[PDB]
Design a protein around this ligand. Structure first.
Ligand code: EFZ
Ligand code: CA
Ligand code: CA
Lengths: 404, 545
RNA sequence: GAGGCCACAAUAACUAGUGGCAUA
DNA sequence: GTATGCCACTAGTTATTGTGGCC
């Protein structure tokens, strides 16, 4: 079968991304995988006149602990975004977020047998590095649609629906959504009947879980105290004052009114009636779904994460600062372990609800993250990410979120 | 025969049309002889009017391809990083073969040849000159190293497959060949390699002409079983220029890979700011001391050993003070594979546990580059000091494999702030203010016991006054104190207990906090009518706003 | 035809984002 | 009223100089 032509935008150059250094055990694992992929025609060795490059990694498989190859096409995906979103975009069903159970299925090997436009193959170049720069570096390029390129599901889309039209008529209230190399299968059935309803699909493809409505935003719960000190009120005011950037009806005027004069931090302050009322109004604003926050499809999603201690992490998903479309907590290892699981959890939620992955703001140094993230990565996509500090008030605020 | 590599010009570009300047009759005579011979061997060919390109003959690389190079496509670049010697493995027998006719042995892509045209001018320059183009990779052309290396890799692959146990490293025009064979069997393998290469026209020195170890390579001296750096001479001068000092820091940084404990921070300070290269710079006595120690380090001979892949790597770090750390990597005690240093060049208030964790991250990355695996660390810090710092810190990290080693100076937290306000201790509300225009500022406190103080400062900032204010509260309080500030800057510096930094104010503050026995420190937002904060704010902003 | 090329380091410059302060 | 500066944290970039090399 012939290939769909693909082109970068006229000013665009191909990806020239530097390969991060790999451990010897991952280099050896990648040499095996690639010589097997070459023996099957899926990749070919390339010469030095190809200047492009994309990073390659080794991650462990979901099922087995055998090694798996991850090519980080984030840069190529950005450079081909007209192709895989406008020209051949895949629509996202708003019903998927409402199923009781959603299953994730790996349909990655489907692309292995569709050829890639010859004029585009040079842009898929990657390099298996060597220890200590002792040998030049083994260069390949793709002959078939690559896993991890967002062009692959778009190109394979008309083939994909033809495979699924039978299963969709038979089961007409099951939603199938595909994002990159994954199938998201949503059903309101119960668990035992759901797991059989996917095996019928797992056989239909072979011939050729998530609980979204359990995802629930928790309210902020303020301290309840029988006796308030100056210190307690000062701490509460700093948090509520900051939080008014989220909830504009929050007020601290009556609480600040109680802190008259140069008081000792442990002095007890009885709450006047005006104070108790401001506080009670504040509690009500907080245990009510925030308003004026609505998803904008023309904007990037952003996920921020705070380290809370004792293996606890809070996160927010937003597009404009303080306008959180979603917030939550992730509970338990090491920091990088937990942080990589949080990122994959949040990205999966974000794929189901909006069909996009968010750009992550991570509270870790870049170089530590780049050294260790593949030690626990199991996904086939890689979200964009950057590295930030955490302001103390941010952490202190989302620490108040009610535990589920 | 060696097959050509297709090479293109950059999109939208034509080839060079650079005019050739006239030359002396002596230069033309020598060029004619050189080119007549190159033409006989088939490396260049005479061309005529059909070719519109030109590149100047090199004026003291026969030809200067700077323009062609700008117009040539990019390549996957060859030998980006060099091996580090500590990543090599010990070998019984080692050989280096320099390939004599390397570029001359590789044909140039036929449709690219026309862009390499050049002219030998006539002596009168009233008659046209002799024009040529290259048939092989030209010396100096951007593409030749990457194409030659790629050709050499395909040539070497059959030989490597039949000789799994022989290491061949290709470096420019040289092959380094290592084996564990006794020298007699090694030399038999060397000659087979020479024969393999000669079938493609690649010539190499015979046994009588091959160099014997040690090999000089990239400033290293490589032995079969060890490596060192070639000698390191530090000039002895009474007066130092900026350029002299730059030369020192480069030699000292080069030495620090094998000479342990090198330090440069005090010499680096002397290079800050404007400075013409000739300006003589007076050496600080701290510089003079550190230069002194470095001279004593470099008096003793040292060497590195090679990597035994069957043993664990071990990295050990020592604090050298003032933000400087030093490390050694070995697999057997007292036999370093390499050493290095780590310095936080920005004069920040980094915590010592945090500086140490960056040293570890630097060493971990370097160790994956050189050996393909991470070492086990021995760190001058107890497991509980490390645990309390990181579980109290907003940032994630992870050091997978380390252990305490009791070699001082140990890393330890100097004080711990309270998490709850102290009963019966005086509450200080502190504040500062400054004008940007005049650099005039004030710092002070007011107290629940009725006390208060304001001090006026010159050549100061909003940031320093907030620290000054905390200085004052600490200075005039008892051994237990609650302090309330609106500067998250000043609070973060204190919570992130700095090492001895450059700011004398911060060191003074850290000293005061050691001597205290209970300090609770709290933040409140400014301009909210919070009592205490409001009174002191009125005090320090009087002659300022 | 005033030299380029690689790694590393230092310096200078442009820094940008987040955060409390602070200007207006 | 959106812009500025001061410095902690986070992330860079193009230039110079130096060390060790290569043309
Ligand atoms: O792995 C090893 N071990 C080793 C030990 C001593 C010597 Cl002198 C040389 C080597 C070698 C190399 C090389 C170039 C980077 C100089 C060799 F290629 F084998 F020669 O690499
Ligand atoms: Ca202040
Ligand atoms: Ca003030």
């Amino acid at each position: 079968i012939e290939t769909v032509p693909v082109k970068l935008k006229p000013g665009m150059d191909g990806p020239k991304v530097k390969q991060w250094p790999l451990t010897e055990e991952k280099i050896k694992a990648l040499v095996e995988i690639c010589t097997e992929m070459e023996k099957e025609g899926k990749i070919s060795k390339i010469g030095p006149e190809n200047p492009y490059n994309t990073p390659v990694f080794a991650i462990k498989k979901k099922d087995g602990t055998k090694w798996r190859k991850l090519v980080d096409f984030r840069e190529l995906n950005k450079k081909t975004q007209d192709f895989w979103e406008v020209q051949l975009g895949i629509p996202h069903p708003a019903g998927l977020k409402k199923k009781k159970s959603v299953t994730v299925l790996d349909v990655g090997d489907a692309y292995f047998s569709v050829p890639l436009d010859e004029d585009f193959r040079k842009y898929t170049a990657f390099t298996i590095p060597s220890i200590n720069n002792e040998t030049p570096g083994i260069r390949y390029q793709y002959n078939v649609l690559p896993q991890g390129w967002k062009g692959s599901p778009a190109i394979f889309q008309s083939s994909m629906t033809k495979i699924l039209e039978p299963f969709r008529k038979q089961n007409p209230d099951i939603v199938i959504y595909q994002y990159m190399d994954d199938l998201y299968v949503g059903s309101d059935l119960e668990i035992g009947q759901h797991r059989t309803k996917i095996e019928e699909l797992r056989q239909h493809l072979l011939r050729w879980e998530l609980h979204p409505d359990k995802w629930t935003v928790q309210p902020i719960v303020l301290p309840e105290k029988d006796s308030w000190t100056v210190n307690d009120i000062q701490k509460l005011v700093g948090k509520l004052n900051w939080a008014s950037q989220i909830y504009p009806g929050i007020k601290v005027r009556q609480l600040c009114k109680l802190l008259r004069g140069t008081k000792a931090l442990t002095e007890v302050i009885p709450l006047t009636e005006e104070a108790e009322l401001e506080l009670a109004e504040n509690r009500e604003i907080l245990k009510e779904p925030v308003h004026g926050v609505y998803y904008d499809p023309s904007k990037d999603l952003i996920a921020e994460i705070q380290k809370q201690g004792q293996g606890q992490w809070t996160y927010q998903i937003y597009q404009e600062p303080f306008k959180n479309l979603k917030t939550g907590k992730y509970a338990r290892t090491n920091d990088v372990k937990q942080l990589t699981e949080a990122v994959q959890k949040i990205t999966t939620e974000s794929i189901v609800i909006w069909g996009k992955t968010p750009k992550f703001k991570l509270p870790i140094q870049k170089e530590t993250w780049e050294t260790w993230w593949t030690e626990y990565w199991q996904a086939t996509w890689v979200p964009e990410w950057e590295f930030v500090n955490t302001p103390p008030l941010v952490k202190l605020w989302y620490q108040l979120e009610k535990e589920p | 025969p060696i097959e050509t590599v297709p090479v293109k010009l950059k999109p939208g570009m034509d080839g060079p049309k650079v005019k050739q300047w006239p030359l002396t009759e002596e230069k033309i005579k020598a060029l004619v002889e050189i080119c007549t011979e190159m033409e006989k061997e088939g490396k260049i060919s005479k061309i005529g009017p059909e070719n519109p390109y030109n590149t100047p003959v090199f004026a003291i690389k026969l030809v200067d391809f700077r323009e062609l190079n700008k117009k040539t496509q990019d390549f996957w670049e060859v030998q980006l990083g060099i091996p580090h010697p500590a990543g090599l493995k010990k070998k019984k027998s080692v050989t280096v073969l320099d390939v004599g006719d390397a570029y001359f042995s590789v044909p140039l892509d036929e449709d690219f040849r026309k862009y390499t045209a050049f002219t030998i001018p006539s002596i009168n320059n009233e008659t046209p000159g002799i024009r040529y183009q290259y048939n092989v990779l030209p010396q100096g052309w951007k593409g030749s190293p990457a194409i030659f290396q790629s050709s050499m890799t395909k040539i070497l692959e059959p030989f490597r497959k039949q000789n799994p146990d022989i290491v061949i490293y290709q470096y420019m025009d040289d092959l380094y060949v290592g084996s564990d064979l006794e020298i007699g069997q090694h030399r038999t393998k060397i000659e087979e390699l020479r024969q393999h290469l000669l079938r493609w026209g690649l010539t190499t020195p015979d046994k009588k002409h091959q160099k014997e170890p040690p090999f000089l390579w990239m400033g290293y001296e490589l032995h079969p079983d060890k490596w060192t750096v070639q000698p390191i001479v530090l000039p002895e001068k009474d007066s130092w220029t900026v350029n002299d000092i730059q030369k020192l820091v480069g030699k000292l940084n080069w030495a620090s890979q094998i000479y342990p404990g090198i330090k440069v921070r005090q010499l680096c300070k002397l290079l800050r700011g404007t400075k013409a290269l000739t300006e003589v710079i007076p050496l600080t006595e701290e510089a003079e001391l550190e230069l002194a120690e470095n001279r004593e380090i470099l008096k003793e001979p040292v060497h590195g050993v090679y990597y035994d892949p069957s043993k664990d790597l071990i990295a050990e770090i020592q604090k050298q003070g003032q933000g400087q750390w030093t490390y050694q990597i070995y697999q057997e005690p007292f036999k370093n594979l390499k050493t290095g240093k780590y310095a936080r060049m920005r004069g920040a208030h980094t915590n010592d546990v945090k500086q140490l964790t960056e040293a570890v991250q630097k060493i971990t990355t370097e160790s994956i580059v050189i050996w393909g695996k991470t070492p086990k660390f021995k760190l001058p810090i107890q497991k509980e000091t490390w645990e309390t710092w990181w579980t109290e810190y907003w940032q994630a990290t992870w050091v997978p494999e380390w252990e305490f080693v009791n070699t001082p100076p140990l890393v330890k937290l100097w004080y711990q702030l309270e998490k709850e306000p102290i009963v019966g201790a005086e509450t200080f509300y502190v504040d500062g203010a400054a004008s940007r225009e005049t650099k005039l500022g004030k710092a002070g406190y007011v107290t629940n016991k009725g006390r208060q103080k304001v001090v006026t400062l010159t050549d100061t900032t909003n940031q320093k006054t907030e620290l000054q204010a905390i200085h004052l509260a600490l200075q005039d309080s008892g051994l237990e104190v609650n302090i309330v500030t609106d500067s998250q800057y000043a609070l973060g510096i204190i919570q992130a207990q700095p090492d001895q930094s450059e700011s004398e104010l911060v060191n003074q503050i850290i000293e005061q906090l050691i001597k205290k026995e209970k300090v609770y420190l709290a933040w409140v937002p400014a301009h909210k009518g919070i009592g205490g904060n409001e009174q002191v704010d009125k005090l320090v902003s009087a002659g300022i706003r």
